[PDB]
Symmetry: C2
Subunit: 307 residues, 2 copies
Amino acid sequence: VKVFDTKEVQDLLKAAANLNGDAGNARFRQIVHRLLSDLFKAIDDLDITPDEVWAGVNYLNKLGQDGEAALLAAGIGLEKYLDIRMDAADRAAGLDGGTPRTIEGPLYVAGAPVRDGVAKIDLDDDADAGPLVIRGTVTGTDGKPLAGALVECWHANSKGFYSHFDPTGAQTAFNLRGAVRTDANGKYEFRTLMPVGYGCPPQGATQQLLNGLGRHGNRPAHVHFFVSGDGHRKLTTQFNIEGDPLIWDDFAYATREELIPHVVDKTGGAALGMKSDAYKEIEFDIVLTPLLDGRDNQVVHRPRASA
Amino acid sequence: SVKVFDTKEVQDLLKAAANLNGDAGNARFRQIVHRLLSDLFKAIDDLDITPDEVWAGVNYLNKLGQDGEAALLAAGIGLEKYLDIRMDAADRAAGLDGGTPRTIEGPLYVAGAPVRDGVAKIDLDDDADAGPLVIRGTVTGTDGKPLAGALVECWHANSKGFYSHFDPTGAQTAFNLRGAVRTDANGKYEFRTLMPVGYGCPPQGATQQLLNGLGRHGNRPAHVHFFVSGDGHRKLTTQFNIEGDPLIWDDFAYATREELIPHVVDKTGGAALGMKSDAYKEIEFDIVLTPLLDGRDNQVVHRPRASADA
Ligand SMILES: [Ca+2]
Ligand SMILES: [Cl-]
Ligand SMILES: [Zn+2]
Ligand SMILES: [Zn+2]
């Protein structure tokens, strides 16, 4: 049977979204009506059974109980899709030359202390992670260095865990999370340890759905960035650690070819405060896009953790 | 607004996300996920849903599951009724629409109630504000013959609108206002209980938050839930509404049916029946069950349900 087009179903959808209601939140009602209508049509078209529907409802309970809705948003490509739509708007406006955006992911933590020029961000010992310097210059698309720009980063430890989200025990607040104001020449530097890739909580809702699809829930090793500066839009980006076997098989679809810098082996680490003389260096220069008529049309407000 | 949905990049992303080109797996699940994700992506593109709006929706899903309310929302936005609409249409096409009308289960069934022969008294806790109610009827097949030994289960709320096992103000006795009766040799069942009152969604919960955003209330008229089952017959999920409730045709869960509003009769003689006052109310609620088609019940629903020990 197919019932979606009947007046009873169409009236039910109008009532459920309160389309004929008194003045209210029209945009919200419009969105709810569209999503509900699409869901009802999919159920009808695919003959989705009550048992199947209630299994989906149960999944939503687990997803929220696990606090994983934003992790799922990354894992089924919704987060990348938002970037696709933002990139398409920038392309239509004729923008080029900026460092490409990529997904934020769900693990930013607000409030890290801001240092001038350089920050050492590994607060907790991690014997399995070697020392890493990340440094670069921030410019605008005209090539000029941006002084006093805010460069923020966050990344995982050798076990794939982030501070404020570590299920094995609390890390020091802001471990492997940093904020630096660029110097007069646009330079920033973080002294940290090398990340290893993230994986979804194995018993959580995201991995349960991925298992049902036959997909893994792993990311290659990477470092997240927010970069902002006077006169410029806020950039959300990342880089991947060169050579990681998952670099082009990220469960969150976030890799971009311009965001895979070279890793260089260096010496002299002790004089930089590193835990060994031998360390790795990544030079990651960043180009910000100017504001348009003084506005940033792509900055995203979403729930974010704090200290 | 940009329109990117129909691009190869987006269609490839959807195929990858649902693993359509992966190894042999759960094809049905991949098909459903791909359709729902595709529809979601298309809606975002068509309505220019912004990242801020999407992340507010994601945040809502976190709250919904934290509150344990996904099945309450399913009722409140009409999805639970929609499943009944589809089951009713299938029954009409199949000629299996001759029994008592179905309505929604709702999310508050609890397995494990003690079963009594013929008559059960189910008000285990006193409730000064609720008067005594007898519910009784006969269970027959569509051919009119009584069904002996059929299982009639019912559950309903107290005078504050709360159900046992789901009461936030304090623990009711296990199985308060929940019971099961095996019909007698002539198909008869009877419950002795107290009159339910309707109720609203948890006011701070995710379902009411969404309903508030839509400008809708989250209330149900007073009602009583039933499962009725028996050998050789399909399992009925139904309810009745208490006659005269002002919300009877303004139920947030869309569950009212005109065939399921029985007359309420005033009676006397309650004390002899173990009720707390001479005056009481009686509701007759007869049940007509449909025989199995081809030996299997193709409308019975499996979903997560609470359970408890008496
Ligand atoms: Ca530790
Ligand atoms: Cl932590
Ligand atoms: Zn990450
Ligand atoms: Zn109910």
